[PDB]
Task: structure prediction
Amino acid sequence: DGLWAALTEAAASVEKLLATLPEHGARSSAERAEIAAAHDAARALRVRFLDTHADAVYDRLTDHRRVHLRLAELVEAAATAFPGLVPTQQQLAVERSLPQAAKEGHEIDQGIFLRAVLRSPLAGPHLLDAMLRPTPRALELLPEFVRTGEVEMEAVHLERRDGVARLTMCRDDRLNAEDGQQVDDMETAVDLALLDPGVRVGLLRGGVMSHPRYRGKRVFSAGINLKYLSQGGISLVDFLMRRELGYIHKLVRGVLTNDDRPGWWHSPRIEKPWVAAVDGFAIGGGAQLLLVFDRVLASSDAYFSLPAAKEGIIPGAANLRLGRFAGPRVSRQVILEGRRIWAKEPEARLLVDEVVEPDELDAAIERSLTRLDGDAVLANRRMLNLADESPDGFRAYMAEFALMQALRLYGHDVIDKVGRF
Amino acid sequence: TPRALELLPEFVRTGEVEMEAVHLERRDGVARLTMCRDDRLNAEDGQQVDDMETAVDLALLDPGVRVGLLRGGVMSHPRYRGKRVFSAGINLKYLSQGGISLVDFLMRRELGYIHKLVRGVLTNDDRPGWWHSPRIEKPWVAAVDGF
Ligand SMILES: CC(C)(COP(=O)(O)OP(=O)(O)OC[C@H]1O[C@@H](n2cnc3c(N)ncnc32)[C@H](O)[C@@H]1OP(=O)(O)O)[C@@H](O)C(=O)NCCC(=O)NCCNC(=O)Cc1cc(O)cc(O)c1
Ligand SMILES: CC(C)(COP(=O)(O)OP(=O)(O)OC[C@H]1O[C@@H](n2cnc3c(N)ncnc32)[C@H](O)[C@@H]1OP(=O)(O)O)[C@@H](O)C(=O)NCCC(=O)NCCNC(=O)Cc1cc(O)cc(O)c1
Result:
């Protein structure tokens, strides 16, 4: 051992330098280099500590894997039980108050933590299962939703109709640009759709926009909120990891329920098929979503892109999933070089099932919904998803992503690009 | 057209003519026709035709022009502000109101500027080589923005 003590020591040097040095941007080069070196020693020890102790740490927090904790609860509890391993709620609030450029990068420590947890064959699957459980917010809204067929949330409007959960993304002023609230809404809505027994199929679609350049037109997604990202308001844990391990993973695998119904022994998860309809365009996080649907429809004029090839963050699990859809050459053209793919080009058929003229689209969406109803579809989509993406594959990738993305979230190149938007 | 013969010397001197529906500029040997009805997506009427034929005539007659370029200009209507648009075709409002002429619009464009893009301008016997090339023709490029 020796590693916990050495870490505690390196974290204290960091806190002493932060307490004594000037604010970020008033620091000299010597001072900038000193604090960077301190952060580096500490982060190195977080990695080494967790390489050997991750399972024991996770066992402490979850009572030897008998309590499912979601990400936000897990990292908070880790901070209080293991001071210096990951940041406290207080330390985060100071960070959140700063613009990205000025942050110390404490979230990186959370990336280290989550990487180590997800790498573990014991802890990893368990945390993934916790994130497939229904959100409390969704359990609380479920009876009203069953009664009313309707919930209005800040970023998402959800409506049950003809056996379909219609999720409409409705941030009309900013092209459905994504943030932490949207993720919370999306997961909540996805949870409701899955738990509601009067829902047989899901539908995800962008709502009518109100910004002058798009007034009266639907738009699917313009991807991550770049303004908020610059201003410091995009959370590694509560946005970037939450969406991947929560609603998006639930689209694929369903919601993990308690043993409280017949058939649980064969289907612990309630999964349903999902249709996405793309109006205008799907960019970044929105394009990423398409890699998880059972059916994808697009308007003739639409395009699909993951644009931040030069100075962007990793586009979620597109690096995991895209290759299976498009092969390695196209996958690199899209992600490494920012190739944008139009609905009407032949290669769109790698991502999109049906491309339809704007005036034929509503009806085509309605028909697609009726084709995905039965139990044969449920069984087949489950078997298809299992073959397409193994639980190990997903876990291994999300483990490395957790840290790789954390590092990109603080990269100088990203902070600069994002500040210019 | 007479209108083109009358504007030709100023055009040769200046490299530039502003018309109601078309802006014409000589640059690097290229006649750049920009269709510039920014309020209505270059919707066509009798005046646009006159301007087009005039511009096409100038481009063909001007000896410092070797190639033509047709392109839509930047729009100003709110739904297209800052975006180029090539053409939304015939002015349907005018057509309803009675202002689309069979002869001065629908036949004129086909037999005039459009046919001149294909066959060139018929000149008088007033230059060497007329016996083999009574028509001055040049190549044309079109660039389509929007639709
Ligand atoms: C969509 C566009 C091409 C349209 O161009 P225009 O028609 O000229 O529109 P604009 O006027 O710029 O946008 C209209 C309107 O939406 C706003 N808008 C559009 N997209 C955004 C984003 N992404 N953020 C913030 N605001 C936005 C824009 O600022 C305008 O509002 P005001 O500033 O208040 O006027 C353009 O707006 C654009 O470039 N948007 C940004 C596209 C982009 O780079 N998105 C981010 C890609 N990167 C990710 O998703 C990263 C990501 C997401 C994830 O979910 C996970 C992950 O691991 C990584
Ligand atoms: C082009 C559009 C799809 C753009 O649509 P939106 O994105 O809905 O934008 P809009 O707001 O409609 O257009 C902006 C602006 O341009 C005006 N606009 C656009 N296209 C036109 C046309 N063709 N005419 C008149 N005004 C037009 C429109 O009315 C708006 O201004 P306001 O009326 O002040 O609101 C739409 O406007 C439209 O439907 N245009 C008409 C398309 C059409 O059928 N055109 C005529 C087709 N038929 C021919 O050209 C026939 C023809 C032509 C010839 O030259 C020779 C011949 O032998 C036969």
Notes: The radius of gyration of chain B is 16 Å. The first strand of chain B starts at residue 16 and ends at 18.
